[PDB]
Amino acid sequence: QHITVRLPKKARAMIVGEITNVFKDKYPIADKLKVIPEYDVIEQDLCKLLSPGFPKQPLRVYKFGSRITGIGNRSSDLDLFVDIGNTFHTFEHRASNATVAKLRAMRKFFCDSEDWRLINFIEQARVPIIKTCHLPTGIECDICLNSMGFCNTNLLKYIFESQPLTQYMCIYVKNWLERCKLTEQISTYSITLMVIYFLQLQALLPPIAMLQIEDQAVLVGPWVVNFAQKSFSELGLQQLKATVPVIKGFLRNFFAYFAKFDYEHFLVCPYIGQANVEIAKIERMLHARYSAYVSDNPECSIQLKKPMVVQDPIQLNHNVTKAVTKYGLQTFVDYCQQTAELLEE
Ligand SMILES: O=c1ccn([C@@H]2O[C@H](COP(=O)(O)NP(=O)(O)OP(=O)(O)O)[C@@H](O)[C@H]2O)c(=O)[nH]1
Ligand SMILES: [Mg+2]
């Protein structure tokens, strides 16, 4: 514990190499993948496959995840939420056995169909998923019955489009995480929220709470999933031109910030969007819907007694890094420190 975990060579080679890849090559690819014809085919085939099994039931498919927000690549999976029976606005604190049952019933169709290959069936994840290759396109699809990802995907799109610097940084840190082999502890989504929070502290992104001042709210259970698509100019937020030197400097400060962050006392909190949000105080700073929810359901409050706390800005009871261990956090912090050193001018 007294020794820093050495930054893996595969990451080191990417950092000391020019960041020009993302600006010139990976960004155009990521932006194209927000919309391609292949997704239409997948959604159609999913409807063709499943609606026979649920003939008299409403059915809609939603695309979400890294491809749809604009930080994906060629090899990314496509994340799909299949809503059977208009469950969109229903929130399940934990995947209900009925929901698992629904997914199990859906698995059979992928095994018997010719256009699909069942790759994996994951019942015991936070979000149970069917992992299946859409053979006509070769795209690996992760199919779930949870609407929240679609909702926070629409928020990230608004953020990325309003402040492209955010998207460049998420592409960079996503690749960094993969080269550091930290994906088992710190997910792409977690680090996306950390980029967003870091830029909120630079007065370049709004607190999400400032986009949900109600006058109306769209809810999934107790969570407010819509938001006002405010002009950044009416928020006084300047929209930066992303240049290689601008991205490099913000990346350097991003890594230095999370290298020195106090994870024992503070949490990453894009909902509040302010510095030094205390773990001991966050639950009283959340609004009436959260307060009422945990009052009646104390067991569903955010998990704060964990090495690393990164709060989802919509599903406010979700610590996205709740799985990070003491040593996983140490590794992340050590890598951030060495990365910042390598990015120094
Ligand atoms: O803790 C989590 C993880 C994931 N998600 C939601 O699930 C989506 C897909 O989750 P994901 O694990 O596929 N992460 P993603 O951003 O797609 O990146 P990649 O590694 O390229 O797949 C994310 O983009 C979020 O919308 C959550 O809402 N909470
Ligand atoms: Mg994904």
Author numbering: 202 to 416, 420 to 549
Show passages lifted from the paper.
We initially crystallized DmTailor180–560 in complex with the non-reactive UTP donor substrate analog UMPNPP, in the presence of Mg2+ ions (DmTailor180–560-UMPNPP). The structure was solved by molecular replacement and refined to a resolution of 1.9 Å. Multiple interactions facilitate donor substrate binding and contribute to its specificity. Tyr390 forms a π-stacking interaction with the uracil base of UMPNPP, while the Mg2+ ion is coordinated by oxygen atoms of the α, β and γ phosphates, Asp280, and two water molecules. His522 forms a direct hydrogen bond with O4 of the uracil base. This conserved interaction is a hallmark distinguishing TUTases from PAPs that has been shown in Cid1 to determine specificity for the UTP donor.
In Drosophila, oligouridine tailing by the terminal uridylyl transferase (TUTase) Tailor of numerous RNAs induces their degradation by the exonuclease Dis3L2, which serves functional roles in RNA surveillance and mirtron RNA biogenesis. DmTailor180–560 adopts a conserved bi-lobed nucleotidyl transferase fold consistent with other previously determined structures of TUTases. The N-lobe, also known as the catalytic domain, (colored in blue) is composed of five β-sheets and two α-helices and contains three catalytic aspartate residues Asp278, Asp280 and Asp343.
